Structure formats: C-alpha cells, structure tokens
C-alpha cells in the first residue's frame, strides 16, 4: 500500500458520529474529546457541511481546531454525521491516495 | 485481526423480522418471522438475550450478548458495518488500555 494518484476520484465514504450510546443507560452521549480527535484530525470531507453558520468547503482538510468545531457544533445539536473520505472507499488500486488518506501525522 | 471465530459467540438475525420468545424449559430459543418468511435460533438458558418479546428487528442485529462473527454478520448485514465493528472494537481494547491511534492506520 502506497500513496500513488493523489486523487483517486471516487465519490464513496463513510460517516462517524459523534455519539456513542451507553448500555445500560441508554441515553446517547458524545465520544469523549480523544475519541474523535482520533478519528476527524487530518481528514477530507466528502461532502459540504452546513451548521453554525460556518460552511465547510467539500474536499476541506482538518485539523485540530476543525475537529474541535465540529464537535462544539455537535454538541448544540447542529450535527452528528460525519462525511469523510475513508481508506476503504478509496478506489486508488494497489495503494491509497491523498484525499482518502489525510495528513502526515 | 484473524477475523477468527469468538469463543462467546452471539446470534444475529439474517433479516428484518419481528421476536418470539419461546422457551419450554428446556432450550430458550428466539423465533424472528417476517411477513413472508420465519427462522428459530436454538439458544442456551444461560446468556441472556437483547431483545425483549415482540420488539422488531434489524438485518445482522445482535440477539443475544457477547462478540459477533466476522463472516457471519458479513453475509448479514453488509461489508459496510462489518468494517465498523472491525476497528471499533480493535480501538474499543486499545483506547481502553490507554493509547490513542488515528482510525487511518
Ligand atoms: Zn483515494
């Protein structure tokens, strides 16, 4: 696996909330801070992202004041999708691509 | 990592139907029938199961407690929530144990 097309152009991704339900106490809670800086830092959205007034551009990297955005507008209830460009959807063939992969850590 | 069977196994209905509880004394076995269809599920009195009498169900959904087979919810549900349960529970051990990693890798 390495990073060839920088874009692969596929249009595929996967969603990840931001809230994690409780067992035995039912009631949905947010991923606490660690757990979604782990998985939105250094990522690519796949679609446009609409709440809070602020706009995210489609195909805008994060980092960690994005993650931290969007979890401020999850907390006020403006979101809990989160359309990002996986490893998985990518359609780059024997390796990954730039979009669908991130930062360099 | 092995996809390899788990020792506590737990059923999961192959599709969307509604419960019936059923138990004789002697095997506690949960009914799930659609409108066309129907299956049992020969289960043990001892692990208890998630679906209380009447409720209805989901394709691959969980009917009792405990790890769910690779392969089995696989053919079941979709590959898309198999890659979910996959990593999640990898990082559900290790952000347990105290080390945080990027979903990427
Ligand atoms: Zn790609």
Do not use: W
Not at chain 1, 34 to 53: C, N, P, Q
Not at chain 1, 87 to 105: A, E, F, I, N, S
Not at chain 2, 29 to 44: D, M, R
Not at chain 2, 58 to 64: D, I, K, R, S
């Amino acid at each position: 696996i390495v990073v060839r097309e920088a874009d692969c152009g596929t249009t595929n991704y996967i969603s990840v909330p931001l809230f994690q339900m409780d067992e035995v106490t039912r009631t949905l809670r947010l991923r606490k801070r660690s757990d979604i800086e782990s998985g939105l830092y250094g990522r690519v959205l796949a679609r446009e992202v609409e709440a809070l007034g602020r706009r995210l551009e489609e195909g805008r990297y994060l980092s960690l004041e994005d993650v931290h955005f969007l979890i401020k507008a999850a907390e006020a209830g403006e979101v809990r999708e989160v359309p990002v460009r996986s490893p998985l959807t990518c359609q780059t063939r024997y390796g990954v691509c730039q979009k669908c992969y991130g930062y360099d850590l | 990592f092995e996809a390899r069977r788990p020792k506590a196994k737990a059923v999961i209905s192959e599709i969307d139907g509604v419960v019936r509880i059923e138990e004789g004394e002697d095997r506690l076995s949960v009914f799930v029938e659609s409108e066309g269809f129907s299956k049992e599920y020969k289960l043990p009195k001892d692990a208890r199961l998630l679906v209380k009498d009447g409720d209805y169900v989901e394709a691959g959904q969980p009917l009792t407690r405990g790890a769910i087979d690779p392969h089995q919810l696989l053919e079941a549900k979709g590959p898309e929530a198999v890659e979910r349960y996959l990593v999640d529970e990898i990082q559900k051990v290790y952000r347990a144990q105290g080390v945080k990693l990027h979903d990427k890798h």
